[PDB]
Every structure is written in structure tokens, then in C-alpha cells.
Amino acid sequence: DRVSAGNLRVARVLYDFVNNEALPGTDINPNSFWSGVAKVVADLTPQNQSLLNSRDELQAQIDKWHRHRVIFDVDAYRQFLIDIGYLLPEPDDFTISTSGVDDEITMTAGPQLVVPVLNARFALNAANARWGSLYDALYGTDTIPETESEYNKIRGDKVIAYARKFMDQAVPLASSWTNATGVSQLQIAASPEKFVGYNVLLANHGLHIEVLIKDVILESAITTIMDFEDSVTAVDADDKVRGYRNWLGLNKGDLTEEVNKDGKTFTRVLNADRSYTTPDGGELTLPGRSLLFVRNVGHLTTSDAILVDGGDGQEKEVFEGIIDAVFTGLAAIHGLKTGEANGPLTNSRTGSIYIVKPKMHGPAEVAFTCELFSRVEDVLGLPQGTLKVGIMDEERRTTLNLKACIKAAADRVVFINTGFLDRTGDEIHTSMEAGPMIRKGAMKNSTWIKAYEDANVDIGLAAGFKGKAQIGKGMWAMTELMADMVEQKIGQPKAGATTAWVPSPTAATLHAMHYHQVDVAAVQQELTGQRRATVDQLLTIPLAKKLAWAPEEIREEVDNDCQSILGYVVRWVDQGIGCSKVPDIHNVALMEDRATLRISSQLLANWLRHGVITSEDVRASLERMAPLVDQQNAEDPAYRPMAPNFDDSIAFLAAQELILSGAQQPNGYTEPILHRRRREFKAQ
Ligand SMILES: [Mg+2]
Ligand SMILES: [Mg+2]
Ligand SMILES: [Mg+2]
């Protein structure tokens, strides 16, 4: 069940999906498509492999360098990084030129949702999360404490009062909103231009508020990243094709999903755009859906969805990132076109497609991404420059060369984002040989992470992002702890981030309040010109000093890390579920994703390498945490317990192998082990 398409031996499920579902309506001759795809693969594969080899070669050099330099000669270290080509010169100041970009990205500051593309139900909700009920968000979360079955009026009243107080912040009266006796320029029984329409529609900081006359709706997830990478499990052509079909469906605009509850079924569909009467009596139409990005995989992994003849290989698995650019690009044409075969809805209003590119190391790797995109646009007949790139700043070689990384994509970049979880994973792996690292929770307060976050913004603004491309920060992982999020996450817009990552539609609605409270444009303007971080700060390796930890602190870290690896991996391996809510050793429900795994496994691998803990301690902790995870999953009938037969569980062995072999994984990446182990489970 592979179709010969010249040099490509394509899994039929993929071949049929492309020819039967994706190609018609694109005006791309099917034979030209496969031939052109063959050629991109032939031409770009050697450079892809070469880039990966450079990764390994640099890491080998750093490992060796630390063998005797074990401490700290900062100057010698820095000059070594220069000599080996790890740290490259900063180019001169420039301004990005990226154009054809939507207003959601250039003009608006607000939340950005990330969702697993493989889950249609979740994807649909994510795309529809552009608008959400503040009342539902308040009532349904701990943002309104339970202090002091059916609706509860004493809660609803707190909800109403909270929204009222929010109204006084975002759309202030001339002379609280509470005292309003009714509404009719708008009148209530400060800035009159914040009345934009009715069907009552208000705008503050470029974001809409709708008061139903009853409820307050907030424009919430302005943009949404449909994720093929860390939040999904996709290890073969079957899984990939599920992902590509959902993405195709979102871009056609006809993705639907049946939802059955309480003996009733409703079909989930995409929301229409929203019409209003303007105050002059004219018409206004606003987007009903989040502007969609897609997160492709990075440069590392290969996929047997296509096996390749020619070049330097023998039926070589194709590079996954290459095929993601092709197939996510192809599907996204329908989100730009308006013919009969292209579905009822479009995504961009401006002729762009937005791909998030993760896990890139350094400017050559950004240049290669841009060439891939260029070659794909050629095969697809999209104008050059249509595939715009969201750059994840989440690898040390990228952070340290960030200005050159942006310049390498100056014509295509629509964001940068501090993917802080991967970035910490890379920090640990890169300096693995330097000595034992501080605890995961100490990393938050480290010199390097502070310079990483600040540099990103500075370099962004210095490259002229204000008004042209987002500057983003990272995910809030604690899904039930929304009072904490409303309290803490205001820090990101206050730091000049025009966007930050949220885990669900409800979190998007609550985080949107922060952008009403903080004028991110003015914050960005006050940041303009400032230089708040240094290369020497970034190069401060977060090594633990001696006598850093009482033995209980060591033990708390180990169990916490093992429980989190196990809770996430067991669902990954046994169920093919890539984004799980997993309760830590302190109880709290977290969004675990592959990057959370990278951090935990690398920290443990580092502690093992330097004798902070033993192999025996690791096994012991894993065995102790297994049944806790089994217990957490008990009410799920699809779950199979890991205990007591730990060595018969592929999931368990996968968690063990991530830690015990963690030091040998390229840059600490979890895919080689996880992909291997998921395939093993499927074939069992
Ligand atoms: Mg369409
Ligand atoms: Mg649209
Ligand atoms: Mg990441």
C-alpha cells in the first residue's frame, strides 16, 4: 500500500488524501505536484541533513570542552563558542519588510491559543474561540472563588459585579457601570468613540467587547495555532493524514464534528463572521473566527509516510518538516481561495498563510526554512512570500544569534515567541557536561532566562516588529488555576509581549482582560531603544553551587519529574494523546506537552550524569510514581495500568529510556524515543 510517484514511494492513505481531497480546487496539476514535491525533496534533503550534523558536531565540541574546564572561565568559553561557529556576529540594525499580513497580527495585541490539530472537536472550538462569554469564563472557573447542579444567583451576582468592574477599566463612563439604569453615541441611564456598533459592540485597545441586553462577550483568541508538533502524537501516515485532513477542513471551512452528550447529538461547526449596524447606520463585518496559524514540525524528524529513492539514500524516510510545509501549505490554499471547490470560509484577508516553525538552531537553519517555504510556494503556485513564518525562539543557538535569525527571515517573519520550555531543555542539554543544573523551579529566577525573555523583546522591537509582527511569550500550563492566571499572566503584556499562549478558549477569554488593562502599544513604545540584556547574561550557565540542596529537595525534584514524565508518556504511548492534563506531585493539573518532557528528562539525565542521584533512585521513583499515575487515570476505561508489571509496560519503559538515555538524545529531543515506542505499542 504505497504508490510510486517517481522517486517517492507514498503511503496510499497519504496519496489518496492529497489527490482526492486536497488538490482539487487549487488549480495545481496533480502530476506537476508530485514531480515538484519529488524535486524539493531531492534538492533540500542534503542541506537538512547537513544542518542536523552541524548540531551534533557543535554539541560534541562543547561536551569535550567542559571535560576539564569544570570551574568559571567565561571569556575563554565565549571565545570558544566563536571559534567553533556557535556564536556568530550580530548584523547591523534593520527593519523587517514582511507585508500582506493580517490585522490580527500587525494591529492587535491579544491572546493566542494553541491546540492539537488531531482533535477536530478541540480544533473547532479553538477556531471559534475568537469570541467567548466572560460570564461563562468567570462562573465556570476559580476566578470567582467558591467562598460563602442548578444555577447559583449569589455566584452569578459576583460574576456580574466582576464584569462590571471590568467594564469600568476597559470602557470607562464619563461619570461605575453598576449604577447604569439602561442604554440608548451611546448613553447610560469617557471616550465616546469606543462605541463601534450594535445588533452593543465596544472596542478598547483594538479588541471588541459585546454587551448582550445578560452577558459580556470578549473577543478572546485573536489567533490560533493548529499544532502538528509538541501537542500531538503522530508517528505514521495514518496519524499525519488525520492531522492534514483536519487542517484541510479548517481552511475549506467545512470541518464538522459530532458531539454526543446526555443521549443528544449536536454537530460542531465553524462560526460565521459577525455583522453589526455602525452608529452612522452603515454596516460592519468582523471576523467570527481566530486567524489560523499552523505549527509544522522542525528539522529533525523523518516520516515513513514517504520513502525516497535517489540522492544519497536507500528508500530513505522523508524529512517530516519538508512534507509538513508541502501538505499544510497545500491545504491552506483553500483558506485563500473563493471558488466552488474551496469551501465556504477563508482564513487570511490579505493573501498570507502562517506557519509556526519550531526547534530551529541558528540563522542558517532559519535561512533553510525560508528556502523550503520558497520552494513549496513554487510547486504550489502560491506567490513567493505567501508562507510567512512564526519563529520560535526556543533553542540556545537561536537565542544567542537571534538578530541574525530574524534577518534571515526579514521578508517572511510574522512573529517571534519565547518557547521557554524547550529553551530550558536545550539549556540543560547544551551544558550537560558543565555540572549539575539548578532545579526546574529555580530556572525561573536564573540570569539566563531573564536575559532570554528581555533580549527577545528588545531585538524584536529593534528589528521594527511594532505594528508589523507579534512578539509572543509562553504558555500558562495550569488549566484549573485561572485566579492565578488572571493575577500572574498580566506580566507578559506588561513586558511588551503583543501576544502570549493560552491553553483553552476559557483561558483566552480571561487573558484577554489583560490586554484591556495594559496598553501594550504604549508599553512597547516605552521599551523602544532600550538594551536590557547581554550576551554574557545569556551565557551564564545555570549550574547549581555546592551544598545547593538538602536531600529532601533532591527527592522532591526527582519524584516530581518522574510523575510528570510518566503521566504524560503513558497517554502518549498507549493512547496517542499528545496533550494531557497531568497532576503534579503538589496535586496541580498541568498542560503537559512534549517540551515539558524534554525539561524533566534532561534535568534528570543531568543529575544522573553528575551523581546528584543514582540510576537506582530513578527506577525507584518511577516505580513509586507509576501507581499514582495509574490511580489518577482509574476512572478512564480506556486506561491500562502500568503497575505492577512495570517491565511489561511499553509506556513505563519509554519513560525510563527518556531519562536513562536522555543524555544521548540529540539536543535532548524526545521524539526519537517516543516515536519508536508509540510505533512499538501500535504493532503490539
Ligand atoms: Mg475556504
Ligand atoms: Mg477570514
Ligand atoms: Mg516548543
From Swiss-Prot:
The active site is at R295 (proton acceptor), D593 (proton donor). Glyoxylate binds at R295, E394, G419, F420, L421, D422. GO terms for molecular function: magnesium ion binding; malate synthase activity. It is found in: Cytoplasm. It catalyses: glyoxylate + acetyl-CoA + H2O = (S)-malate + CoA + H(+). Mg(2+) binds at E394, D422. It comes from the Bacteria. SUPFAM superfamilies: Malate synthase G. Gene3D superfamilies: Malate synthase, domain 3 (3.20.20.360), Malate synthase, domain III (1.20.1220.12). GO terms for cellular component: cytosol. Keywords: Cytoplasm, Glyoxylate bypass, Magnesium, Metal-binding, Oxidation, Transferase, Tricarboxylic acid cycle. Its EC number is 2.3.3.9. Its main location: cytoplasm. Acetyl-CoA binds at V114, R121, F122, S231, R268, P503. The keyword Ion transport does not apply. PANTHER family: MALATE SYNTHASE G (PTHR42739:SF1). NCBIfam families: malate_syn_G, PRK02999.1. Homodimer. This is Malate synthase G. It comes from Mycobacterium leprae (strain Br4923).
